[PDB]
Write an enzyme that holds these catalytic residues in place. Sequence first.
Site, mmCIF file in Angstrom:
data_model
loop_
_atom_site.group_PDB
_atom_site.id
_atom_site.type_symbol
_atom_site.label_atom_id
_atom_site.label_comp_id
_atom_site.label_asym_id
_atom_site.label_seq_id
_atom_site.Cartn_x
_atom_site.Cartn_y
_atom_site.Cartn_z
ATOM 1 N N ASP A 121 0.826 -1.193 0.000
ATOM 2 C CA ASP A 121 0.000 0.000 0.000
ATOM 3 C C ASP A 121 0.867 1.253 0.000
ATOM 4 N N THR A 159 -7.079 3.787 -2.087
ATOM 5 C CA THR A 159 -6.801 2.386 -1.746
ATOM 6 C C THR A 159 -7.843 1.425 -2.264
ATOM 7 N N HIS A 265 1.546 8.706 5.119
ATOM 8 C CA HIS A 265 0.637 9.731 5.623
ATOM 9 C C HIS A 265 1.217 10.532 6.793
ATOM 10 N N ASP A 308 -0.758 -0.200 -5.015
ATOM 11 C CA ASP A 308 -2.035 0.386 -5.392
ATOM 12 C C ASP A 308 -1.929 1.846 -5.907
ATOM 13 N N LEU A 689 -18.450 5.011 -24.294
ATOM 14 C CA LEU A 689 -18.714 4.200 -25.483
ATOM 15 C C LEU A 689 -19.499 5.010 -26.500
HETATM 16 C C1 LIG Z 1 -15.276 -1.646 -19.095
HETATM 17 O O1 LIG Z 1 -15.640 -3.021 -19.057
HETATM 18 C C2 LIG Z 1 -16.958 -3.316 -18.634
HETATM 19 C C3 LIG Z 1 -17.183 -4.832 -18.625
HETATM 20 O O2 LIG Z 1 -16.980 -5.354 -19.926
HETATM 21 C C4 LIG Z 1 -17.991 -2.642 -19.543
HETATM 22 O O3 LIG Z 1 -19.201 -2.662 -18.830
HETATM 23 C C5 LIG Z 1 -20.233 -3.458 -19.420
HETATM 24 O O4 LIG Z 1 -20.945 -2.717 -20.392
HETATM 25 C C6 LIG Z 1 -22.035 -3.398 -20.978
HETATM 26 C C7 LIG Z 1 -22.614 -2.507 -22.080
HETATM 27 O O5 LIG Z 1 -22.999 -1.247 -21.569
HETATM 28 C C8 LIG Z 1 -23.066 -3.813 -19.911
HETATM 29 O O6 LIG Z 1 -24.048 -4.664 -20.470
HETATM 30 C C9 LIG Z 1 -25.373 -4.112 -20.299
HETATM 31 O O7 LIG Z 1 -25.901 -4.357 -18.988
HETATM 32 C C10 LIG Z 1 -27.038 -5.182 -18.714
HETATM 33 C C11 LIG Z 1 -26.707 -6.312 -17.733
HETATM 34 O O8 LIG Z 1 -26.104 -5.773 -16.568
HETATM 35 C C12 LIG Z 1 -26.039 -6.727 -15.478
HETATM 36 O O9 LIG Z 1 -25.334 -7.943 -15.741
HETATM 37 C C13 LIG Z 1 -23.905 -7.902 -15.765
HETATM 38 C C14 LIG Z 1 -23.364 -9.314 -16.030
HETATM 39 O O10 LIG Z 1 -23.199 -10.094 -14.861
HETATM 40 C C15 LIG Z 1 -23.335 -7.240 -14.497
HETATM 41 O O11 LIG Z 1 -21.935 -7.100 -14.573
HETATM 42 C C16 LIG Z 1 -23.971 -5.866 -14.276
HETATM 43 O O12 LIG Z 1 -23.447 -5.279 -13.091
HETATM 44 C C17 LIG Z 1 -23.668 -3.844 -13.046
HETATM 45 O O13 LIG Z 1 -24.779 -3.450 -12.243
HETATM 46 C C18 LIG Z 1 -24.678 -3.686 -10.838
HETATM 47 C C19 LIG Z 1 -25.872 -3.038 -10.137
HETATM 48 O O14 LIG Z 1 -27.074 -3.342 -10.809
HETATM 49 C C20 LIG Z 1 -23.379 -3.131 -10.231
HETATM 50 O O15 LIG Z 1 -23.169 -3.683 -8.947
HETATM 51 C C21 LIG Z 1 -22.142 -3.368 -11.110
HETATM 52 O O16 LIG Z 1 -21.083 -2.553 -10.644
HETATM 53 C C22 LIG Z 1 -22.423 -3.075 -12.589
HETATM 54 O O17 LIG Z 1 -22.678 -1.688 -12.730
HETATM 55 C C23 LIG Z 1 -21.975 -1.056 -13.819
HETATM 56 O O18 LIG Z 1 -22.577 -1.258 -15.095
HETATM 57 C C24 LIG Z 1 -23.895 -0.736 -15.236
HETATM 58 C C25 LIG Z 1 -24.447 -1.115 -16.614
HETATM 59 O O19 LIG Z 1 -24.724 -2.501 -16.653
HETATM 60 C C26 LIG Z 1 -23.907 0.781 -14.981
HETATM 61 O O20 LIG Z 1 -25.233 1.256 -14.937
HETATM 62 C C27 LIG Z 1 -23.217 1.133 -13.657
HETATM 63 O O21 LIG Z 1 -23.022 2.522 -13.545
HETATM 64 C C28 LIG Z 1 -21.864 0.441 -13.513
HETATM 65 O O22 LIG Z 1 -20.935 1.068 -14.372
HETATM 66 C C29 LIG Z 1 -25.498 -6.016 -14.230
HETATM 67 O O23 LIG Z 1 -25.874 -6.725 -13.067
HETATM 68 C C30 LIG Z 1 -27.805 -5.703 -19.931
HETATM 69 O O24 LIG Z 1 -29.157 -5.865 -19.560
HETATM 70 C C31 LIG Z 1 -27.704 -4.738 -21.108
HETATM 71 O O25 LIG Z 1 -28.420 -5.241 -22.215
HETATM 72 C C32 LIG Z 1 -26.243 -4.512 -21.498
HETATM 73 O O26 LIG Z 1 -25.695 -5.654 -22.138
HETATM 74 C C33 LIG Z 1 -22.390 -4.579 -18.771
HETATM 75 O O27 LIG Z 1 -23.297 -4.768 -17.708
HETATM 76 C C34 LIG Z 1 -21.153 -3.850 -18.261
HETATM 77 N N1 LIG Z 1 -20.435 -4.652 -17.286
HETATM 78 C C35 LIG Z 1 -19.965 -4.184 -16.120
HETATM 79 C C36 LIG Z 1 -19.244 -5.175 -15.245
HETATM 80 O O28 LIG Z 1 -20.091 -3.019 -15.730
HETATM 81 C C37 LIG Z 1 -17.625 -1.178 -19.806
HETATM 82 O O29 LIG Z 1 -18.478 -0.659 -20.807
HETATM 83 C C38 LIG Z 1 -16.147 -0.981 -20.159
HETATM 84 N N2 LIG Z 1 -15.842 0.441 -20.252
HETATM 85 C C39 LIG Z 1 -15.203 0.997 -21.285
HETATM 86 C C40 LIG Z 1 -14.986 2.475 -21.212
HETATM 87 O O30 LIG Z 1 -14.792 0.368 -22.262
HETATM 88 O O1 LIG Z 2 -6.485 -7.293 2.946
HETATM 89 C C1 LIG Z 2 -6.513 -6.231 2.286
HETATM 90 C C2 LIG Z 2 -6.097 -6.260 0.833
HETATM 91 C C3 LIG Z 2 -6.361 -7.385 0.082
HETATM 92 C C4 LIG Z 2 -5.982 -7.373 -1.389
HETATM 93 C C5 LIG Z 2 -4.799 -8.000 -1.791
HETATM 94 C C6 LIG Z 2 -4.453 -7.988 -3.146
HETATM 95 C C7 LIG Z 2 -5.302 -7.354 -4.080
HETATM 96 O O2 LIG Z 2 -4.966 -7.347 -5.406
HETATM 97 C C8 LIG Z 2 -5.417 -8.365 -6.184
HETATM 98 F F1 LIG Z 2 -6.734 -8.444 -6.059
HETATM 99 F F2 LIG Z 2 -5.092 -8.122 -7.437
HETATM 100 F F3 LIG Z 2 -4.870 -9.514 -5.805
HETATM 101 C C9 LIG Z 2 -6.495 -6.734 -3.667
HETATM 102 C C10 LIG Z 2 -6.840 -6.744 -2.314
HETATM 103 N N1 LIG Z 2 -6.938 -4.944 2.914
HETATM 104 C C11 LIG Z 2 -6.891 -3.791 2.074
HETATM 105 C C12 LIG Z 2 -8.152 -2.979 2.051
HETATM 106 C C13 LIG Z 2 -8.408 -2.090 3.295
HETATM 107 C C14 LIG Z 2 -7.538 -0.822 3.355
HETATM 108 N N2 LIG Z 2 -7.642 -0.384 4.733
HETATM 109 C C15 LIG Z 2 -7.201 0.872 5.312
HETATM 110 O O3 LIG Z 2 -7.408 0.988 6.491
HETATM 111 C C16 LIG Z 2 -6.529 2.011 4.599
HETATM 112 C C17 LIG Z 2 -5.261 1.914 3.997
HETATM 113 C C18 LIG Z 2 -4.701 3.040 3.381
HETATM 114 C C19 LIG Z 2 -5.406 4.289 3.382
HETATM 115 N N3 LIG Z 2 -5.096 5.545 2.865
HETATM 116 N N4 LIG Z 2 -6.144 6.374 3.154
HETATM 117 N N5 LIG Z 2 -7.099 5.663 3.843
HETATM 118 C C20 LIG Z 2 -6.628 4.372 3.977
HETATM 119 C C21 LIG Z 2 -7.198 3.226 4.596
HETATM 120 C C22 LIG Z 2 -8.291 -1.420 5.535
HETATM 121 C C23 LIG Z 2 -8.313 -2.695 4.623
HETATM 122 C C24 LIG Z 2 -7.108 -3.614 4.941
HETATM 123 C C25 LIG Z 2 -7.291 -4.983 4.301
HETATM 124 CA CA LIG Z 3 -3.696 2.466 -0.412
HETATM 125 CA CA LIG Z 4 -22.007 6.579 -24.948
HETATM 126 ZN ZN LIG Z 5 -3.260 5.889 2.220
#
Ligand SMILES: *[C@@H]1O[C@H](CO)[C@@H](O[C@@H]2O[C@H](CO)[C@@H](O[C@@H]3O[C@H](CO[C@H]4O[C@H](CO)[C@@H](O)[C@H](O[C@H]5O[C@H](CO)[C@@H](O)[C@H](O)[C@@H]5O[C@H]5O[C@H](CO)[C@@H](O)[C@H](O)[C@@H]5O)[C@@H]4O)[C@@H](O)[C@H](O)[C@@H]3O)[C@H](O)[C@H]2NC(C)=O)[C@H](O)[C@H]1NC(C)=O
Ligand SMILES: O=C(/C=C/c1ccc(OC(F)(F)F)cc1)N1CC[C@@H]2CN(C(=O)c3ccc4[nH]nnc4c3)C[C@@H]2CC1
Ligand SMILES: [Ca+2]
Ligand SMILES: [Ca+2]
Ligand SMILES: [Zn+2]
Length: 804
Positions: A121, A159, A265, A308, A689
């Site tokens: 970190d 983080t 920090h 990170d 997009l």
């Molecule tokens: C970076 O890469 C990602 C992944 O490839 C791209 O994001 C994808 O874009 C497409 C096209 O816009 C989306 O498909 C549409 O969405 C729905 C289905 O959505 C559901 O199912 C998927 C599959 O499991 C799931 O990942 C989705 O999860 C979203 O919603 C959750 C809450 O409801 C949330 O917890 C999660 O974070 C995620 O939210 C994000 O995406 C939504 C849009 O879906 C957006 O509103 C929000 O702000 C977040 O950004 C969801 O349950 C279909 O019905 C449509 O027809 C359509 O196909 C994908 O869903 C979306 N995938 C992800 C993981 O976000 C990015 O476009 C790409 N970015 C760039 C710049 O290239």
């Molecule tokens: O155990 C993990 C990581 C697992 C992991 C390991 C690898 C990884 O990478 C991957 F996924 F690619 F493997 C992702 C997560 N922890 C990271 C998350 C949070 C961070 N945290 C803080 O208190 C905190 C630190 C710095 C800050 N600066 N300013 N505020 C801050 C607050 C509490 C907690 C500790 C546990």
């Molecule tokens: Ca950090």
């Molecule tokens: Ca657009």
């Molecule tokens: Zn920090």
Amino acid sequence: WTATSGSCKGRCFELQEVGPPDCRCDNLCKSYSSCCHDFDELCLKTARGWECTKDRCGEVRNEENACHCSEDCLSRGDCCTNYQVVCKGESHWVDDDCEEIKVPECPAGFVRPPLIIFSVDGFRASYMKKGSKVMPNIEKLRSCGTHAPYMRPVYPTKTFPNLYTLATGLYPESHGIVGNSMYDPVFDASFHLRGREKFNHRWWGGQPLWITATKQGVRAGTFFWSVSIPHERRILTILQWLSLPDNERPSVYAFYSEQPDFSGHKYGPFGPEMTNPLREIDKTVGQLMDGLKQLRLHRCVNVIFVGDHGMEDVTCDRTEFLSNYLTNVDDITLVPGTLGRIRAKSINNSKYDPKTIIAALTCKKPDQHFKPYMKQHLPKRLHYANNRRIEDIHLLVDRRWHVARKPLDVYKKCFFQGDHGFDNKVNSMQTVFVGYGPTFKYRTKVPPFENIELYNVMCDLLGLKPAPNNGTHGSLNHLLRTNTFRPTMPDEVSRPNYPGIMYLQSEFDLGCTCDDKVENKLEELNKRLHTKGSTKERHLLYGRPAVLYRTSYDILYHTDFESGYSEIFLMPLWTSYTISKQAEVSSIPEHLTNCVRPDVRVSPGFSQNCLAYKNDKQMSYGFLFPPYLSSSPEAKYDAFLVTNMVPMYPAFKRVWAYFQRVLVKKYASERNGVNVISGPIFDYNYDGLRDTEDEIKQYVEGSSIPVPTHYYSIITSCLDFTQPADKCDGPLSVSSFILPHRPDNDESCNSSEDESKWVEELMKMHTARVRDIEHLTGLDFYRKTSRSYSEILTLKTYLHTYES
Ligand SMILES: *[C@@H]1O[C@H](CO)[C@@H](O[C@@H]2O[C@H](CO)[C@@H](O[C@@H]3O[C@H](CO[C@H]4O[C@H](CO)[C@@H](O)[C@H](O[C@H]5O[C@H](CO)[C@@H](O)[C@H](O)[C@@H]5O[C@H]5O[C@H](CO)[C@@H](O)[C@H](O)[C@@H]5O)[C@@H]4O)[C@@H](O)[C@H](O)[C@@H]3O)[C@H](O)[C@H]2NC(C)=O)[C@H](O)[C@H]1NC(C)=O
Ligand SMILES: O=C(/C=C/c1ccc(OC(F)(F)F)cc1)N1CC[C@@H]2CN(C(=O)c3ccc4[nH]nnc4c3)C[C@@H]2CC1
Ligand SMILES: [Ca+2]
Ligand SMILES: [Ca+2]
Ligand SMILES: [Zn+2]
Ligand SMILES: [Cl-]
Ligand SMILES: [Cl-]
């Protein structure tokens, strides 16, 4: 309630999670306060420390020790990591010369080389050089393995957003963790570092590595560690797991260190107090590497050392207060710090106007250490808009500074000398990447890359199929000795039309006029060749871009430029042209100032008109290929075709004109020619997009001419600059931008001055990857070069940052 009456007997750091009310014995039990009464007694043993001593060699097994030096410790898989050095005369891993690992040297029963993610970190990129003297283990990994000079984090450089991007290959806007602290308006809940809300799964979108591994039958050690578990216990627990029977042994592991962030920090990035945490990390690394060598795994396991974000000098007295700008400071909520996010204090306030907030925060003090933005207007490279948890108002804060709401928030809520969170192109924010092992290359330096790319690579190292993410799979193949993924160009969806001369002047009723009547078989056949594309290998150096969606468009050839003209959007999707070093800049002659000519290859019905621009008082127009760069006075007439024209606010025309008239020539001089591809971007829904035809929110008044949200250019030349752009035999060099198409220049506080004092600075801020433009246009570039596809993907993910 939790009935914590059970025991941890023989369950220390169990890999499956048991449900209520039965007590838990995993590395997360503490954070849920659900541990068994004897967890600490049995699993968190400390007696006698972490190292074997001379007297301890060949001891009797006391099971209350933290680790063991007994004869049976290798069998039990719980020796102190230094056991073999003290007791068997073996050397430490660091003290061995490094030998290339040409093939995996794994013990029997190992189906694949395991992967260990060692996350640190706040490990600023520059620590690798500046601390090298006190980090011998890390320095060995770096010099013998594969390393980048730095790795770019995502914005905000916080983080939680960055660790979860590492795990998912997704931008925070996509995975949902947009900050260490968030408010979701639909949940009406707040996510904080302190509290239990952060534990609900509803905050965490995407698919992280450990879920990806599991769904595909690859077993994962638990990634997250409780704060009260000492680093030594974390290494031993991972080494214990590596001793488990084949059917139980995880293939992927994670270790996490809160240092050097924690000290950073307090003491700033280079405080004299920073040497010790750096010393300690290195010792922890030594313990893992010694422990792996015991288990005969040090030439079998792939180890990723990754950070990170970096760390900046930041103090209390460098805080900008909103109360010094606003009158109604009590009607807003601010998420403060190294970034500002503003929303209304009452969720449904009618008379809340973000316009007046923005205006109150714009260029109001000569020295202003932040800049306000509507989120859709943030630089597109940040990819920080498309989430309901991202407030409409954003403050990008200057490096070294903080923003707060009132002075009371800072003095009643200095203790700190360091912080992070700023724009991800900032040098102090850059972090680290090293890969070491059988699958990584040997003593190999790679160019800097973005942390969104690692998820694909970690999937490759484990034989997994990555969930859909924001990485460009194959752009980091050059880190690896052996690649499990061969990337391939996407197929073109739409093929172009190649229209010839089909329409007569009088068929057009566009309200456009030009003084072009002023006017030989040799040079009339010559210019016909130009319209047929005789000069096309000069102005289109890497093949035509491919259109990756269904549309109707025409390729138009001209002496000086080539274009892909859209009959849907009534303008080009792209305009391609080469400017050699020798090329000269001319002006638009006096009679041709208002000149717009009909294009006899394109129907009146699929053309723009001048009347719409006459009527629309807010909107003027510009040209994709610049008239200023015509190769001859006769060729300049081509630049004035209605098919080269695009809608532009007068304010934006100031930026564009300076780019076309001055900057292109400057770049061509510095780079020994440049190829330029320019065009419009339509992203009204700020999802990064391309928008479809039925999503356009703005037209030039009373027309079907859509107004772009942005204008891009991709500027390519030869990496070896002794060669001209148009005769390059080797690797390419590129820089690109995506300019927001805005009716004002409020972003540039110096815009009332000459364009030479501000325009290029604005362009630098909006620097972009070719890949960002691809997402935004549905186009695919560099289809025809002599370079390998992997190299071209690396080229497309390149960002020119302008940092020193
Ligand atoms: C970076 O890469 C990602 C992944 O490839 C791209 O994001 C994808 O874009 C497409 C096209 O816009 C989306 O498909 C549409 O969405 C729905 C289905 O959505 C559901 O199912 C998927 C599959 O499991 C799931 O990942 C989705 O999860 C979203 O919603 C959750 C809450 O409801 C949330 O917890 C999660 O974070 C995620 O939210 C994000 O995406 C939504 C849009 O879906 C957006 O509103 C929000 O702000 C977040 O950004 C969801 O349950 C279909 O019905 C449509 O027809 C359509 O196909 C994908 O869903 C979306 N995938 C992800 C993981 O976000 C990015 O476009 C790409 N970015 C760039 C710049 O290239
Ligand atoms: O155990 C993990 C990581 C697992 C992991 C390991 C690898 C990884 O990478 C991957 F996924 F690619 F493997 C992702 C997560 N922890 C990271 C998350 C949070 C961070 N945290 C803080 O208190 C905190 C630190 C710095 C800050 N600066 N300013 N505020 C801050 C607050 C509490 C907690 C500790 C546990
Ligand atoms: Ca950090
Ligand atoms: Ca657009
Ligand atoms: Zn920090
Ligand atoms: Cl202006
Ligand atoms: Cl479309």
